[PDB]
């Protein structure tokens, strides 16, 4: 069912993304899209490309095109959530991320993103609940203790912040190779 | 007779350009120019410097100074044409590039620049004619097959585009091995 | 007197600065400052951080906070001078730099900075006097001969400029 033109442009696209030049890959993803119109994958890959180039708003638009074709596209949502967050559109990220966590409830990174989102929207206790899940799902990861630390700082509870940070340090030390 | 100050500042200039710091070289090229006023070489090198810094509009200006002193300065034209094209001033780039091709008709890169200029000015068939010359003059070069491809895409002739791209791929493969 | 929270955030701060990520270190310097309020060192480190990030105007402000607590803080002034100069506020840099040179009169770099400052404020002869000090205090440094050269160029004395630059070249050659 996949045409020869699509196979070709998908191939060249992949090369460009592997040699790390998104801007070129885009031109060939457009072509793959042209020839398998209604296939979400090329659109999805555009989305990834546009996000790496920092053209965030247009990545959100492309991810929406992918979600129109597959409303439960797990990764499209994850990625869209991630960019909505990088752009500081927290209120719009929350429902998306909360959907991701519902599909992949053992995925620390997701709960971390969710926590950052809640924190941006000034729902601090919900950010802490999320980020704590991320810590519990992956306790080795410094990033998560660190944010829990700063989240406690903003709560004006400096006692707990320090507990989180003393652990940040214990971790940085034992990862000295 | 060149004169000792010129020899000196030329020397230092060269060092700076070789160690890859244009911004410093400029200061010395100015001086070489001060002392061999009417010699086009320093000006020419300024132009190259400015272009590498991305100060394009000022490079064009300096290349014009060089062409006022040597109206057939082959390289000054080539470089001016190249920057006119980077800045998207296509109409002005065409006569210049068309002059370079006339002086160096076996030079694929010139024809490629010319093709990109025509394509920017929405003269598509003329861009294909140029880019095809470039391909014919240097068939190993992926870049030229690739633009031919995309130029056919804009013509809405996807059959030929794919023929050019299948060759893009055959080339990318045999340059891994 | 230095307490456990400070020791901790100072520690983490240092790590961040060593692994070369200023933006993170800042967050922790803030915390060290919160807990040893009135200690100038965290503030001074903020200053350095901000200047590395290119947030120059806010570095000047923090260095000022450090100078309010220690008016002769030698390094605070040096760094503040250096950033005032990078930002092209020459008239304000001169008194600061002239203070640094008073405190560290064998420091070429300080005189070089001073000379650049004078030059920016169109006091060219004073710039040459400073830069010359820098060259005399550190004759191996190309940078200083170079600026002397260009300072003479602006004076329209091309004979001397060339003498400085022939030396710039002699030095670039013997250093490959």
Author numbering:
A (entry chain E), B (entry chain A): 38 to 214
C (entry chain D): 38 to 213
Task: Quote the study that presented this structure, word for word.
Here, we have solved a new structure for MamA from the alternative species, Desulfovibrio magneticus strain RS-1, and compare between other, previously solved MamA structures and this distantly related species of MTB. By comparing these volumes to a standard calibration curve we determined that the three peaks correspond to sizes of a 13-meric oligomer, an octamer and a monomer. Crystallisation trials of octameric and monomeric ArsTM resulted in the appearance of a single crystal form that diffracted to a resolution of 2.88 Å. ArsTM monomers assemble to form a trimeric ring, each enclosing a ~15 Å diameter inner void; the crystal asymmetric unit includes six ArsTM monomers arranged as two trimeric rings. The employed forces that allow the stabilisation of each trimeric ring include salt bridges as well as hydrophobic interactions between the N-terminal of a single monomer and the C-terminal of a nearby monomer in a continuous manner, resulting in a ring with surface properties akin to a Möbius strip. As such, ArsTM presents a distinctly atypical binding surface since, as mentioned, the protein-protein interactions involving MamA typically bind via the concave or convex surfaces. Unexpectedly, but not altogether unsurprisingly, the triple mutated residues (E140A, K141A and E143A), along the ‘backbone’ of the monomers, were found to be at the centre of a crystal contact. The tight packing of ArsTM within the crystal could not occur with the original residues, which contained long and charged side chains and hence, could not be crystallised. The overall structure of the ArsTM monomer contains 10 anti-parallel α-helices, folded as five TPR helix-turn-helix motifs, namely TPR1 (H1 and H2), TPR2 (H3 and H4), TPR3 (H5 and H6), TPR4 (H7 and H8) and TPR5 (H9 and H10), similar to previously determined MamA structures. In ArsTM we could not detect such domain movement, as the conformations of all six monomers are similar. Whilst these salt bridge-forming residues are conserved in ArsTM (Arg47 and Asp76), the salt bridge itself is not since the distance between these two residues is too great.
